[PDB]
Amino acid sequence: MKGDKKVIQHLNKILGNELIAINQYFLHSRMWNDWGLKRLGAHEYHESIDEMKHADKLIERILFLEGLPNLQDLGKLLIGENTQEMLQCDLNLELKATKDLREAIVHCEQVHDYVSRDLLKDILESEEEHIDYLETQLGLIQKVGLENYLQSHMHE
Amino acid sequence: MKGDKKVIQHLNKILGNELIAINQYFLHSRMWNDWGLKRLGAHEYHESIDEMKHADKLIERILFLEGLPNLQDLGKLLIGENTQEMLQCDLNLELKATKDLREAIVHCEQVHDYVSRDLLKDILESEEEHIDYLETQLGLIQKVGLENYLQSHMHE
Amino acid sequence: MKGDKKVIQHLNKILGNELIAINQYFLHSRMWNDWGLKRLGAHEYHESIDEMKHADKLIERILFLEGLPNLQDLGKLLIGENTQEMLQCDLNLELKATKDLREAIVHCEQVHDYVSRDLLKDILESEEEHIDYLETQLGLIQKVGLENYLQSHMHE
Amino acid sequence: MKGDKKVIQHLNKILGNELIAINQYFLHSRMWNDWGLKRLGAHEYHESIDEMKHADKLIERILFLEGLPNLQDLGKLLIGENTQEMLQCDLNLELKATKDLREAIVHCEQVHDYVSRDLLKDILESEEEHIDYLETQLGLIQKVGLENYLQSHMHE
Amino acid sequence: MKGDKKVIQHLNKILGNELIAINQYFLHSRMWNDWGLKRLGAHEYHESIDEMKHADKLIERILFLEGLPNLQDLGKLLIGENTQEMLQCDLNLELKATKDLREAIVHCEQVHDYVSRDLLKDILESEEEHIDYLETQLGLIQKVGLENYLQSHMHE
Amino acid sequence: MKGDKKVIQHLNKILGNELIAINQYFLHSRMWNDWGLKRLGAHEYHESIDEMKHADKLIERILFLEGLPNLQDLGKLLIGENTQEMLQCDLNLELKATKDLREAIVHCEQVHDYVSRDLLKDILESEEEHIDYLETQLGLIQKVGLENYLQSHMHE
Amino acid sequence: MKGDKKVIQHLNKILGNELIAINQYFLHSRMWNDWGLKRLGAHEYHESIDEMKHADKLIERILFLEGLPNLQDLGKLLIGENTQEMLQCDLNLELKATKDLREAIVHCEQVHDYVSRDLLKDILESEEEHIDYLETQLGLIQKVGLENYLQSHMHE
Ligand code: HEM
Ligand code: HEM
Ligand code: HEM
Ligand code: HEM
Ligand SMILES: O=C1NC(=O)c2c(NCc3cc(F)ccc3O)cccc21
Ligand SMILES: O=C1NC(=O)c2c(NCc3cc(F)ccc3O)cccc21
Ligand SMILES: O=C1NC(=O)c2c(NCc3cc(F)ccc3O)cccc21
Ligand SMILES: [K+]
Ligand SMILES: [K+]
């Protein structure tokens, strides 16, 4: 079913953010596991998988709309080098992600692509949950101290 | 445990091929599903997952060797536009992949990184199984004809 | 709860489309079964049942909003005489139904009937799924040939 | 128990035919598997296994009769280059085998080795079942065409 | 996947050794069973089966590498006339087998056919296990005496 | 089966390293248990058991190759006096063990003792896993602090 | 709990004997397995494990008493060259062990370390059971003859 060209462009822009997220969260996960912070590693792995599921649904919608999913262009990964900075990199990425989702939804609404809108709303819901998670972790580091926060994420 | 620098370079080169494969096989999978060729779609999905598992193990080894896994640089996806060409693109990618695995193993053997060698041998085994699969599919298209081959991959 | 007069008019228009589809899809199903294309017959039966469910929910929403659900004014059924034509007739009907759905959602949004909109969006998602199925089948007739396509739909 | 010398010679002749069939059918099975024709590969594997079981029973009977089972002399394998040739090579072998079985049964009856006869009759029943299968496959190739015939033997 | 010509020649040589072993061990098994030494017969049967499995894997690898598996040429069986001779015949055959496997592994390593090496290494492990069994049996005959050794192998 | 004299010397050297490790890790385990660091005690016990298993397999391989396994010449145990020191003493030992493993594998490869190599490679993989654990613990002492690290290892 | 200095010396002496027995019995076990005398090999393995458990308990007792368990000094292993000698070597070692146990219990009683005495008494009961086993095996070698005795220990 031939879709709106600019909608497909938005979907592909959203897909690009998810593809960045997949790799950034997967790398952070395995960095945390390597450091013995297995609870962070497992959670961040699950964030990676969730972005993979989002990318899948975007790929599928783009193909249905008879566009070409762009998996070739990979934007810049925000890889941190310690726990506090990795969380902030994830958060910075999510704030960019939600901004683009909102702009995409605006355009879907204008051209009446209500099904695409619904898909992007569902993704936006998951990304805001991720932001909640990240904001909470950063807040906890201040409340309990970095050493305790890391201690609490050694074991699953 | 600090690894050999050139070994880590090889591992990262292997990882780059797997990252290309992940996206190429995932896209082909969803293209086939979109076309109603669900048996090809499901198989190619499983090839994608297998490359994901390989990438994971490479990322983990690189981190253990105290290198930096490169998930930023994404080489060129060989995306075909019909079944015969998609299979050939996968095969062309695998023949490149196995060549690089062999060179990587040569160097691991020289510097005595026997554990890395074992990991790359296991990956090489999976990639040669994939080549077998691809060569067989291409051969079947000739034997049964394209229309029958596609018919036989409509339903799972 | 007194609803907007024109919302109810839209809902009754969508209802009218679903009533055509019920009968069109049911007849196509029984024609395919009579021809021994039992897999098409079964799938088309489930398409008819799905439209019956949408009709039910429209009738319920109209009665809640204190309108009169129009089950009396049956529009034109698009019945094919062979499989390719029947699939195309379903597609043609679905493409009108989705245009009317989008127009109804526009109006629901204007007058703030957000629950009616949500219902129409859910129905729209179904109908686009039906369009995906129908386009996929017509593409498969091309890719594998008519004789093979029909063969693959003889047995469930 | 001292058997008749000519009976033992016949049993070794039947054994020799079975040792050819074991290898011919095993190789044909693995060829069909390599080509993706896994239904033929599996069925031919089971034919090879059945010949192994016959060979076992012949070896056991020859030893009971105080003869020396000949596993050293391997006759000519009839290996085909395509499916039609392979099937016809199997059939040519089976027809030689059943001829030899009948001549061996005649001699067992003449010298009153009724147990050896009963063993050979059971093997003969198995070989006639393989001939039925082969003649049926060759006829199916004519009825449905080679492309369809190979299509139907891709999947198990 | 086109393999190295000499690797394939090596694989066919190893296949030739396995084909001798299959028949030699199968005949020894059935001789021991005929003599009432059923524990020896059973164990020797399982050695024959294990060689059959090795031969299968070699055939499959040769065909994947686009060579022709040689099941036609059958080398000399080493058949003993009593238990001690039969065990020593098996041991002589195994010592030739492992010499050939080492030479083939050398060549696989030199041309970087690492998957073929791994296959031959696994077969070599099984053959060294068989050498261990055989040397151990020959030793037990000396320790417990032949009559006791045979007594211990009457009943499974 | 007569093995290479120097292979057996290497195997006995690896064996000697495992015998030190068994005793070193067992004592460390019981020291941690006595101090109430039961999670470290349990984990170190399982490290000791794992070395016992490696020792067993080395002893078995040496006896198969007709050498004399040296369980008599116990080298120097590296016992720490506090947790950080004990972990470092384990790491120091593992780093010598892996160097000796790589030297032994070099020689096994030269004289074509591929089964001994395979055994040593499997042991090497274990030992590198142990190194990963030990480095991770020493890094965690930094990241979370000593008091927190010890606290997290009081209870299993 | 600070223990008596000479109690701790006795416990380390007992521990030293247990450490010898661990290695002597483990090597004897694996020699018997290599020779195909698997029932002896299994029983001797379990004797080695029992000494391992006694060593554990002595190490734990010494640490509780604030001593340093000596796992560094390994006394002379008594290794036989045949079954008869191996059993007698074990028995000679056990007879020195029980001597040293009795002298340690005397001292424990004198200084009122009644819990250490109870531990040593339990270990003495195990060692006297081992002496019973060993004396009985040497008696059986006489009563059934060496060939029969060895025959009865081939199979588990
Ligand atoms: C750095 C690149 C990637 C890595 C390291 C990675 C890793 C993984 C791993 C370890 C799994 C679990 C599979 C299993 O154990 O069964 C997985 C699952 C999955 N991956 Fe990835 N992946 C990567 C990229 C992608 C991409 C780019 C996509 C889609 C475009 C994707 C889609 C999926 C899906 C759909 C699943 C299944 C999740 C489920 O269980 O429902 N992955 N991935
Ligand atoms: C206003 C028009 C119709 C409405 C609102 C309607 C509604 C429904 C509903 C709600 C169901 C149950 C679906 C479920 O499983 O949850 C159903 C079932 C069914 N409908 Fe209709 N339907 C309509 C017309 C028709 C027509 C014209 C036919 C046949 C010509 C038909 C044939 C069937 C059949 C065979 C079933 C399944 C009955 C069973 O349980 O065995 N329907 N319908
Ligand atoms: C003297 C020649 C042979 C004899 C007498 C023989 C006999 C047997 C027997 C009795 C079985 C067990 C069948 C059952 O009861 O299920 C068997 C299994 C088998 N044979 Fe043979 N065989 C021979 C040659 C071969 C050859 C040349 C190959 C392949 C190169 C082969 C491959 C196999 C395989 C793969 C199995 C299945 C083993 C398993 O996984 O359990 N055999 N054979
Ligand atoms: C040559 C030296 C040794 C060898 C070859 C050896 C071998 C083994 C083996 C193979 C096991 C069984 C592992 C399994 O679960 O599969 C074991 C268990 C064990 N070992 Fe050792 N060991 C040695 C020294 C020691 C020492 C010195 C100690 C204590 C100081 C010890 C304490 C233990 C304990 C407590 C167990 C578990 C027993 C149970 O099942 O409760 N080992 N050993
Ligand atoms: O398709 C039809 N949907 C209807 O509601 C309907 C009819 N409704 C009569 C009616 C009027 C009213 F003012 C209040 C209640 C009520 O039932 C009559 C004929 C046909 C249809
Ligand atoms: O396929 C072969 N079948 C055989 O029996 C055989 C051989 N016989 C050894 C033998 C055993 C015996 F119990 C009495 C006499 C005797 O010669 C030698 C090579 C090959 C084969
Ligand atoms: O740690 C030890 N590993 C041993 O093999 C060993 C001993 N072996 C004696 C022996 C010699 C022989 F030529 C044949 C068999 C045999 O058992 C003696 C003392 C200590 C150890
Ligand atoms: K804390
Ligand atoms: K067909």
Q: How far is CA C83 from CA C45, C91, E108, in A?
A: 15, 12, 57
Distance CA E19, CA E71 (A): 8
Answer yes or no: are the C-beta atoms of B92 and B134 closer than 8 Å.
Answer: no
Q: Does B151 touch chain C (CB under 8 A)?
A: yes
Is D30 in contact with E76 (Cβ distance < 8 A)? Answer: no
The burial class, CB within 10 Å (0-12 / 13-18 / 19+), for E18 is buried
CB contact under 8 A, G71 and F31: no
Q: What is the signed CA dihedral for E80, E83, E86, E92, rounded to 10 degrees?
A: -130
The owner of tokens 């990882």 is B15
- Which residue has 């590498």 as its token pair? E65
Tokens of C127: 């109908």
Can you give the three-state secondary structure of chain C, one letter per residue? Answer: CCCCHHHHHHHHHHHHHHHHHHHHHHHHHHHHHHCCCHHHHHHHHHHHHHHHHHHHHHHHHHHHCCCCCCCCCCCCCCCCCCHHHHHHHHHHHHHHHHHHHHHHHHHHHHCCCHHHHHHHHHHHHHHHHHHHHHHHHHHHHHHHCHHHHHHCCCCC
The chains in contact with chain D, meaning 3 or more Cβ pairs closer than 8 Å, are B, E
The residue behind tokens 């006759």 is: D75
Round to whole Å and give the CA distance between C8 and G35: 93
CA distances from E1 to B136, C155, D33 (A): 10, 38, 15
For tokens 């000094």, the residue is G73
Q: What secondary structure letter does DSSP report for A4? A: P
Give Cβ neighbours of residue G138 (< 8 Å, ≥ 6 apart): G84, G87, G88, G91
Q: Ligand 9 being an ion, which residues bring their Cβ within 5 A of it?
A: B 148; C 148; D 148
Buried b (16+ CB within 10 A) or exposed e, E68-78: ebbbbebbebb
What separation in Å is there between the alpha carbon of A87 and the centre of ligand 1? 21
Enclosing H/E stretch for D46: helix D38-64
Q: Which of B49, G36, E63, F71 is nearest to D37 (CA)?
A: E63
Is E47 in contact with E130 (CB distance < 8 Å)?
yes
CB E10 within 8 A of CB E104: yes
Distance CA G82, CA F88 (A): 43
Resolution in A: 1.8
Chain breaks in chain C (C to N over 2.5 A) after: none
Could you give the residue ranges of the DSSP H alpha helices within B35-113?
38-64, 83-111
* Residue G25 parent element (H or E): helix G5-34
Q: Which residue is closest to D152 within chain B, CA to CA?
A: B152
How far apart are the C-alpha atoms of E65 and C33, rounded to whole Å? 49
Contact B147 C151 (CB under 8 A): no
b/e per residue, E110-126, with b = 16+ CB within 10 A?
A: eebbbbbbbbbbebbee
Residue D65 has, within 13 A of its CA and on its CB side, a CA count of 24
Give Dmax (Cα) for chain A: 54
Residues 6+ positions from G28 with CB-CB distance below 8 Å = G44, G79, G80, G86, G89, G90
Query: B129: which 2 tokens?
Result: 């199984």
Those residues whose C-beta lies under 8 Å from the C-beta of residue G147, and which sit 6 or more positions away, are E143, E144, E145, E148
G 42-81 residues with CB below 8 A of E? none
Residue F60 near residue F117, CB atoms below 8 Å: no
E1: which chain B residues are within 8 Å (Cβ-Cβ)? Answer: 128, 131-132, 135
Answer whether A59 sits within 8 Å of B33, measured CB to CB: no
Interface test mutation site (partner B, options A1, A22, A29, A30, max chain B beta carbons within 10 A): A30
Is residue A92 part of an annotated ligand binding site?
A: no
Fill in the amino acid letter for F111: V
Q: Is the CB of C142 under 6 A from ligand 5?
A: no
Q: Which atom of ligand 3 is nearest to the CA of D55?
A: 5
DSSP helix/strand/coil, G26: helix
Question: Across the B/C interface, how many CB contacts are shorter than 8 Å?
Answer: 29
Residue G40 makes CB contacts below 8 A (sequence gap 6+) with: G29, G32, G83, G153
G81 lines ligand 7 (CB under 6 A): yes
The stretches of chain F forming alpha helices (DSSP H) are 5-34, 38-64, 83-110, 114-144, 146-151
Tokens of A101: 């989702």
Which phi-psi region, left, alpha or beta, contains residue D36 (left: φ > 0; alpha: ψ -120 to 50)?
left
Q: What is the 3-state secondary structure (H, E, C) of chain E?
A: CCCCHHHHHHHHHHHHHHHHHHHHHHHHHHHHHHCCCHHHHHHHHHHHHHHHHHHHHHHHHHHHCCCCCCCCCCCCCCCCCCHHHHHHHHHHHHHHHHHHHHHHHHHHHHHCCHHHHHHHHHHHHHHHHHHHHHHHHHHHHHHHCHHHHHHCCCCC
Cβ contact G82:G28 at 8 Å: no
Cβ proximity of E34 and D64 under 8 Å = yes
Residues E89 and E78 sit within 8 Å (Cβ to Cβ) = yes
As given in the structure block, the two tokens for residue B109 are 């053997």
Whose alpha carbon is nearest atom 32 of ligand 1?
Answer: A52
Q: How far is the CA of B53 from the centre of ligand 1 (A)?
A: 8
Q: Is the CB of residue F68 below 6 angstroms from any atom belonging to ligand 7?
A: yes
CA dist., res. A29 & res. A39, Å (int)? 9
Instruction: Compute the CA torsion angle D30, D34, D39, D44 (nearest 10 deg).
Output: -10
Neighbours of D68 (CB within 10 A): 13
Contact A91, A36 (CB under 8 A): no
For residue C145, the ligand closest to its alpha carbon is 9
D97's tokens: 């085998």
The crossing angle, in degrees rounded to 10, of helices D38-64 and D114-144 is: 170
The position carrying tokens 């496997």 is: E101
Contact predicate B91/B39, CB 8 Å:
no
E155 is in an annotated binding site: no
Nearest to E74 by CA among E26, E40, E32, E112: E26
Other C-beta atoms closer than 10 Å to the C-beta of F108 total 24
The Cα–Cα gap between B153 and C16 comes to: 38
DSSP state of B10: H
Q: Residue D19 CA: which ligand is closest?
A: 3
- Please, which residues 110-149 of chain E have a Cβ atom closer than 8 Å to chain G? 136-137, 139-140, 143-145, 148-149
Residue type (1 letter), E19: L
Is F112 annotated to bind ligand?
Answer: no
F123 near F54, Cβ under 8 Å? yes
Instruction: Give me the helices (H) in chain A, please.
Output: 5-34, 38-64, 83-111, 114-144, 146-151
CA C75 to chain centre: 13
The dihedral sign for the CA sequence A57, A61, A66, A72: negative
> Which ligand is nearest to the Cα of residue D144, counting in written order?
9
Phi, psi of A63 (to 5 degrees): -65, -40
Do G147 and E151 lie within an 8 Å CB cutoff?
no
- Please give the Cα distance from C55 to A115 (Å, whole number): 20
Can you tell me whether residue G70 is helix, strand or coil? Answer: coil
Nearest-neighbour CA in chain C from B85: distance (Å)? 14
